[PDB]
Homo-oligomer: A and B are copies of this chain.
């Protein structure tokens, strides 16, 4: 079959795996907010930029997180327009675990990349780079 189709299938298997094997029910957006907040305080707008999604998608994910006692907001003392989010105690084990599953998957990607010569990997780089640009938009 075409490479177009294998890419289509690659995207589908990522989507299907994430819905199938993995009392909070966090979305990936919310887990990746918690990931980024676990290493520094950030604003709604830093989060939106870092994840490349709308500010309104971030505001929505943060409201649901605050509702589940996962985050707490505190305003900045020099500029009251600015709110910083940080993890509550209850979120920290949830975040750590998600971070640890990312760490394990990085080894999976290492092993797979290892099958390519370093020549091959410049092309793999070039491919993942353009693909990611495209899938962003």
- On chain B, the residues within 8 Å of A134 by CB distance are 108, 112
With a CB–CB cut-off of 8 A, which chain B residues contact A126?
A: 116, 120
Known: A10-B135, A18-B15, A109-B7. A120 touches B121 (CB 8 A): no
A51-81 Cβ-contact flags toward B at 8 Å (1 or 0): 1111001000000000000000000000000
Chain A at the B interface: mostly helix, strand, loop or mixed? helix
Sample of 14 more A-B contacts, CB < 8 Å, known A3-B124, A11-B105? A3-B113, A4-B113, A5-B106, A6-B125, A10-B131, A12-B32, A13-B132, A14-B15, A17-B136, A19-B27, A19-B57, A20-B53, A123-B124, A124-B127
10 A–B pairs (Cβ distance < 8 Å), ordered by A: A3-B124, A3-B128, A6-B125, A8-B105, A8-B106, A10-B135, A12-B28, A16-B28, A19-B57, A120-B123
